[PDB]
Design a protein around this nucleic acid. Sequence first.
RNA 1: ACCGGCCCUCCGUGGGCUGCGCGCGAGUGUGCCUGUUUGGACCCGAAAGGUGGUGAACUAUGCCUGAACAAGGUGAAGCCCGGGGAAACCCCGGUGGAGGCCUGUAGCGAUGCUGACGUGCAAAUCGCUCGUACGAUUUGGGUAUCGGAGCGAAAGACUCAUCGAACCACCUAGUAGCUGGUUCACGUCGAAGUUUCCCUCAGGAUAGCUGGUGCUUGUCAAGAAGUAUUGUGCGGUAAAGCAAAUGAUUAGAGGGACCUAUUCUCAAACUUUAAAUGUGCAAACAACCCAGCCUUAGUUAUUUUAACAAGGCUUUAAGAAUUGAGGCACCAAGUGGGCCUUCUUCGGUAAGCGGAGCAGGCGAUGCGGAAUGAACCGCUUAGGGAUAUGUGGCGUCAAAACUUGUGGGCUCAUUCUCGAUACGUGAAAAGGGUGUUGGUGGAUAUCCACCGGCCCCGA
RNA 2: AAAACAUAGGUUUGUGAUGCAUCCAAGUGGUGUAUGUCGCAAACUGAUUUCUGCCCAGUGCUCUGUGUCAACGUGACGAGAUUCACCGACGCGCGGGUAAACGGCGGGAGUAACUAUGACUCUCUUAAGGUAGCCAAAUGCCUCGUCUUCCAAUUAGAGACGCGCAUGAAUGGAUUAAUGAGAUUCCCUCUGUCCCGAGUUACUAUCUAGCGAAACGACAGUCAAGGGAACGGACUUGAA
RNA 3: AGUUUGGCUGGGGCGGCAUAUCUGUUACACGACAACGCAGGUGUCCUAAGGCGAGCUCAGUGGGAACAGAAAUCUCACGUGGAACACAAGCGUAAAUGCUUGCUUGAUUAACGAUUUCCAGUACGAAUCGAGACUGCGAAAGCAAGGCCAGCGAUCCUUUGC
RNA 4: GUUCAUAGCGACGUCGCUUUUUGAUCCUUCGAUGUCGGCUCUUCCUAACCUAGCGCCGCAGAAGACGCUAAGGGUUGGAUUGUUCACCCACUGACAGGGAACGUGAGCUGGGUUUAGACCGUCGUGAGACAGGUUGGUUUUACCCUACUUGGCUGGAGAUUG
RNA 5: GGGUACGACCAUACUUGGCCGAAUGCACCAUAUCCCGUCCGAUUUGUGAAGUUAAGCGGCCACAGGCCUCGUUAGUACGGCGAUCAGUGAUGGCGCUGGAACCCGGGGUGUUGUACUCU
RNA 6: GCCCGGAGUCCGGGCACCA
Length: 194
Amino acid sequence: ARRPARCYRFCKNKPYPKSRFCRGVPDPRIRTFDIGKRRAPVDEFPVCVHVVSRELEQISSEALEAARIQANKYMVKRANKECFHMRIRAHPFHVLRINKMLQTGMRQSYGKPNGTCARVRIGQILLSMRTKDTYVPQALESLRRAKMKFPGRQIIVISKYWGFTNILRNEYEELRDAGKLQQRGLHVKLITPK
RNA sequence: ACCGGCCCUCCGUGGGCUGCGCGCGAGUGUGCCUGUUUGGACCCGAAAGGUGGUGAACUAUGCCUGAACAAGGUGAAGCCCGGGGAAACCCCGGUGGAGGCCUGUAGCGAUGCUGACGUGCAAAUCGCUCGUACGAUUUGGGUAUCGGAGCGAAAGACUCAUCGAACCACCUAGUAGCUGGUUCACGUCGAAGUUUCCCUCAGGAUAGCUGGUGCUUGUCAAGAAGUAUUGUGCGGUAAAGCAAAUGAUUAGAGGGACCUAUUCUCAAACUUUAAAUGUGCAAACAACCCAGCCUUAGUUAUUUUAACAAGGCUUUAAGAAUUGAGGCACCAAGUGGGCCUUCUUCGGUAAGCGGAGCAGGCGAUGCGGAAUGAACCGCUUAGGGAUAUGUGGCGUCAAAACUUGUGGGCUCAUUCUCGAUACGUGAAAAGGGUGUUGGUGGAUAUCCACCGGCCCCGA
RNA sequence: AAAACAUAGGUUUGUGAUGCAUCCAAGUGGUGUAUGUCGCAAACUGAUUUCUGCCCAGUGCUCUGUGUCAACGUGACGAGAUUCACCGACGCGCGGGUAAACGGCGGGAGUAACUAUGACUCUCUUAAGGUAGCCAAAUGCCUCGUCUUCCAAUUAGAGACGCGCAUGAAUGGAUUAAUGAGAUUCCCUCUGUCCCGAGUUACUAUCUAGCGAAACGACAGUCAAGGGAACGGACUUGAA
RNA sequence: AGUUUGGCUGGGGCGGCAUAUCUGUUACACGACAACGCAGGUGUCCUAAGGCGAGCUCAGUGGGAACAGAAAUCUCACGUGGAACACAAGCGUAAAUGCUUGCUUGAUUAACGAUUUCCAGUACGAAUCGAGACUGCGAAAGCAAGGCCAGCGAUCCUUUGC
RNA sequence: GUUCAUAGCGACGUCGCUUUUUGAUCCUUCGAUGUCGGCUCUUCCUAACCUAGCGCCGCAGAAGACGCUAAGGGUUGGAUUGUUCACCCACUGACAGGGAACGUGAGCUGGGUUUAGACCGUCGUGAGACAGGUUGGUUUUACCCUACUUGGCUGGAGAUUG
RNA sequence: GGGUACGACCAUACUUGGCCGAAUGCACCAUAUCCCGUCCGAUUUGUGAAGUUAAGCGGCCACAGGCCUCGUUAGUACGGCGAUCAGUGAUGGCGCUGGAACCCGGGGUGUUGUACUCU
RNA sequence: GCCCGGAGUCCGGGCACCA
Ligand SMILES: [K+]
Ligand SMILES: [K+]
Ligand SMILES: [K+]
Ligand SMILES: [K+]
Ligand SMILES: [K+]
Ligand SMILES: [K+]
Ligand SMILES: [K+]
Ligand SMILES: [K+]
Ligand SMILES: [K+]
Ligand SMILES: [K+]
Ligand SMILES: [K+]
Ligand SMILES: [K+]
Ligand SMILES: [K+]
Ligand SMILES: [Mg+2]
Ligand SMILES: [Mg+2]
Ligand SMILES: [Mg+2]
Ligand SMILES: [Mg+2]
Ligand SMILES: [Mg+2]
Ligand SMILES: [Mg+2]
Ligand SMILES: [Mg+2]
Ligand SMILES: [Mg+2]
Ligand SMILES: [Mg+2]
Ligand SMILES: [Mg+2]
Ligand SMILES: [Mg+2]
Ligand SMILES: [Mg+2]
Ligand SMILES: [Mg+2]
Ligand SMILES: [Mg+2]
Ligand SMILES: [Mg+2]
Ligand SMILES: [Mg+2]
Ligand SMILES: [Mg+2]
Ligand SMILES: [Mg+2]
Ligand SMILES: [Mg+2]
Ligand SMILES: [Mg+2]
Ligand SMILES: [Mg+2]
Ligand SMILES: [Mg+2]
Ligand SMILES: [Mg+2]
Ligand SMILES: [Mg+2]
Ligand SMILES: [Mg+2]
Ligand SMILES: [Mg+2]
Ligand SMILES: [Mg+2]
Ligand SMILES: [Mg+2]
Ligand SMILES: [Mg+2]
Ligand SMILES: [Mg+2]
Ligand SMILES: [Mg+2]
Ligand SMILES: [Mg+2]
Ligand SMILES: [Mg+2]
Ligand SMILES: [Mg+2]
Ligand SMILES: [Mg+2]
Ligand SMILES: [Mg+2]
Ligand SMILES: [Mg+2]
Ligand SMILES: [Mg+2]
Ligand SMILES: [Mg+2]
Ligand SMILES: [Mg+2]
Ligand SMILES: [Mg+2]
Ligand SMILES: [Mg+2]
Ligand SMILES: [Mg+2]
Ligand SMILES: [Mg+2]
Ligand SMILES: [Mg+2]
Ligand SMILES: [Mg+2]
Ligand SMILES: [Mg+2]
Ligand SMILES: [Mg+2]
Ligand SMILES: [Mg+2]
Ligand SMILES: [Mg+2]
Ligand code: NA
Ligand code: NA
Ligand code: NA
Ligand code: NA
Ligand code: NA
Ligand code: NA
Ligand code: NA
Ligand code: NA
Ligand code: NA
């Protein structure tokens, strides 16, 4: 088994990523960072809900995978499968080491790569979900259950922007009528004279 | 420039090196203290090494000549008398007294109680029990073999309570980077556990920190400053970026790979950009200008430059520093195990763990506070009065509100018992509460959602 | 005090005296030897019974005809020191012998009418590839191996099995009547070993008369918690 | 008979080399900084892979040509270095420090000149700026006394040159 | 779990407690703090096995599962093994888990571990080695202070005085 | 208002496309006896004027890219010094003080020295 | 390093060692 997560909670070391110097790294537990209807035009989902961290700490890849499974399961059961789209915005790039105990003691104690984790900051957004205005109570409950899989303190807020887009929610449909917006996939670009 | 020595060239009134050289002498004898070295070497201490002698009365083994060993059991060879048989030969009964034979005294030993005693009767003894007891048996006197040697039915056993190398005297006060000790008073000063080298890591040499003796001077300040200001240089950490190069990486879109523009998320060994704190130089007299002048084998096609000089001239508002003794030696001690802390930081799950950076401490140091504590807070110390504070306090212990205010709120806590001085984690989490007390946003003439304070469950 | 040593029995080696072993500073010096192979000196194994397999590649010991190895000799150049050339033994190399000298003595595949196993085959390789025997043995890690017997119950004992980490033949193998203050298991008898302790005796201790030490001894001697060199008699607070 | 039988070290031993040395990072934007901290190298190689002059442009991509294809050779265009520079890494470089070619021996001697790095401001190794001789390549200015920075060694003794 | 997330469980995750395991460290003790197990004896803790009283169930009864107050009382006899541990037989209401210098050697015992003798296997040329097996192997002193158990003498309120 | 030769700073000067270009000049351009060099007078070398601004070159323009400058981001991120400061912690604000970066928005698209020269 | 032997020369032997 792996050690309890209390042994890797605080950001005590330099980032230490996977590179040509650190090679024998196991694969992270989470591989997909999107659930729900990814192929949805930006106009379909106008409501966005965030969960944002309030601590400076590390979150393991197992916890991210546990949160993804729980959030998807509740939305599918309590609502339609296609009525939402969720994105995980924390990728595990920090490698953790372990010193497994022919020599004995603390001699030559540099460890071997064992797992991966994500380093988060205060005010950073961890998960983002966009949905319709009639499924907000379901989205809030699903995110509530998901955040119970993380260490530390997190808060749940509703954004003032149109879903996954940097344009204010009330002012989006004016700039859509008067064609000042160029649609590129899931985001939009403000057209300017240039 | 001159003396000695080694040289170079275009060979001259060149050139460049070297001496513990010279450059109007400073040595020498003696007294005294301190340091280095050898000697017993400040005092006491090994395990060892060598030279010459004394021991076989303990004990080991051989030899000469003497002494000793109750009482029983078993019953070998030889011999006698009877039977059986054709022979070969076989059988009974006696007698006899063999044996590194058996039971068992004396003798010679020492298995168990892991008995007694264990400052004893005794530096190995005592009580029961036990091995053997005609044999490779026990024992007196005499004699023979020893110290790197003797002897051994062999255990490194024994050689006078001494043996994996006896005893006595001497070399010998053997050497010890290691342990222990080292005897009067007051006064002036006062550290280091770091650098480089060492068969170096419990030790030295070397520089640094310190003391003594000074020298040359100055007196408001020279060759002053762990500090500013002004001017002028240096930089790639924190941050930021990936819509910029290198590396890693998620997803849609427009024309299954592919292309274009975007997009989520990153970097100690990535970077266009780029701080704060830092770091170099300058801010006047052995100096700078101005003018004229001399010299050269330097530069230049010549002047003009370069360098060394000599006689005259000038010079000590704008936030616009402020503090004050400068420089130079000689001789020598201790130290060369360090530890703690704010902040920065590497290894480790972590540690009262291991290892670094700038600074301050303890060590070497008390005093006043945190009840108690090397390092925390205050303050740092000649012997004493008066006055006032610092940290911390004013219910009693215990000096101070003889329980201060004519100031607001909040809290009720049943068996490790609510809470109450930081450092000190030197006691606590996720998650909950229609306990009570405050806010924010919505609805209606009180209802919903969310966020705090103290208390309660988790414990 | 033994399973160790010795022992009888067994095997091997040297040696015909101007010898083999060997003392010793030395000599017409000394010991086995007052002896003479049925003797003396040097090793190993350990009664009897039945046996003692294969290996001379390594190391050692030992026996026979030309590369190398020292001084001494014999010639040269040179004025001479110096130098050069040739000759030069045992030994070491070559060639034999020797294991009751020291010692050593294998892997991997396939294969028989249900499965299993493998008499059979192939392959790599050695100086030789462990034979007769014996075993979870005082030698077996795994291991308290697996089966039977002994008990109500056995990591124990005995009897079997054997790809044996790492058994094995005078580094002796296997077996043995008699013997043992040798190690282990079970049975009968017996009991204060125990269930579970009780009563009695003699000498002490205990009191007295006489006599009369030693060890040890910073100072001393009630606790709880705290902090402290992280387990206080002393310090802080409390309680006696 | 005499003497010896390394050291460091989260005890010692086995292991390893942190024992003499080079590059990046830890390292906190001057310099300096530890660990048996991380990622890697060194005891060699080269008469050319040294010196200079000249000419040229690399990696790669796209459009074209019998056999010929994803990949052979020829041609045009783009191409800030994404190639190469003996080897580890960093820095550096485009009519060049790269590639080809021509000629050469500055990889010699160099009067004890001065200096940097480690540092006691000692030595050793490496490197920087000069003076003199004789030369090499260039029309000349000029460049060169090795291959830039790692690749090595006291007293005594032996041996060679003048 | 006939359905039913939560009677009883609960994956993927995440937050803690304890010092009855073993590691990590090297602060105290090397002019010595007697090192396994058993026997004997006392006391403490609760994370409750039995005994008292209750709630709840997928509690009809009987037998049970889960939880609460509660540590007053109780918690065995044997075969094998040095064992702690382990595993069987049997009784019982029940045969709970732990601490006290891994309680307890001037209280015992000495089977094991760990000297000197000796045998075996493997290793080593050898002397010898093995956290492999085997057999044999001295357990010393209390009369001191305190603590505890019993046993006696005797003052004293300004706790000796005013 | 210009050309040529030699330059300094080295993108406000570069990259792409389009348009225009009076004269002097600069070019493209003709050819291989000789000097010289190539597989090839392509480049290079030696000798002429037959044609032409086609290209090179100069000037202007582009909701052009890039580059330069000023604002904004923002007193934000980060920092030096202090507390018997808050918080179980992770961390954070406060006092005295220093102070960024990209995106984004406005503007701009070479300056100039010596000599010989054309209008 | 010396003497050889076998292939201008690489191996196999018997000897010898003060930086
Ligand atoms: K002395
Ligand atoms: K004697
Ligand atoms: K008899
Ligand atoms: K007897
Ligand atoms: K020193
Ligand atoms: K015996
Ligand atoms: K005996
Ligand atoms: K015996
Ligand atoms: K014999
Ligand atoms: K036999
Ligand atoms: K008496
Ligand atoms: K008396
Ligand atoms: K008496
Ligand atoms: Mg655990
Ligand atoms: Mg002495
Ligand atoms: Mg000696
Ligand atoms: Mg005698
Ligand atoms: Mg007898
Ligand atoms: Mg006894
Ligand atoms: Mg007798
Ligand atoms: Mg012995
Ligand atoms: Mg002395
Ligand atoms: Mg002392
Ligand atoms: Mg003083
Ligand atoms: Mg040395
Ligand atoms: Mg950063
Ligand atoms: Mg010193
Ligand atoms: Mg000290
Ligand atoms: Mg103080
Ligand atoms: Mg008072
Ligand atoms: Mg005895
Ligand atoms: Mg026999
Ligand atoms: Mg026998
Ligand atoms: Mg042989
Ligand atoms: Mg052997
Ligand atoms: Mg054969
Ligand atoms: Mg066996
Ligand atoms: Mg056995
Ligand atoms: Mg039994
Ligand atoms: Mg058996
Ligand atoms: Mg064998
Ligand atoms: Mg044999
Ligand atoms: Mg054997
Ligand atoms: Mg007998
Ligand atoms: Mg016996
Ligand atoms: Mg106490
Ligand atoms: Mg005491
Ligand atoms: Mg710095
Ligand atoms: Mg630096
Ligand atoms: Mg060139
Ligand atoms: Mg070099
Ligand atoms: Mg020169
Ligand atoms: Mg060079
Ligand atoms: Mg002591
Ligand atoms: Mg003691
Ligand atoms: Mg004691
Ligand atoms: Mg314990
Ligand atoms: Mg104990
Ligand atoms: Mg005892
Ligand atoms: Mg005991
Ligand atoms: Mg005791
Ligand atoms: Mg034993
Ligand atoms: Mg302070
Ligand atoms: Na770390
Ligand atoms: Na007898
Ligand atoms: Na000491
Ligand atoms: Na024997
Ligand atoms: Na042989
Ligand atoms: Na066999
Ligand atoms: Na058995
Ligand atoms: Na050592
Ligand atoms: Na309880």
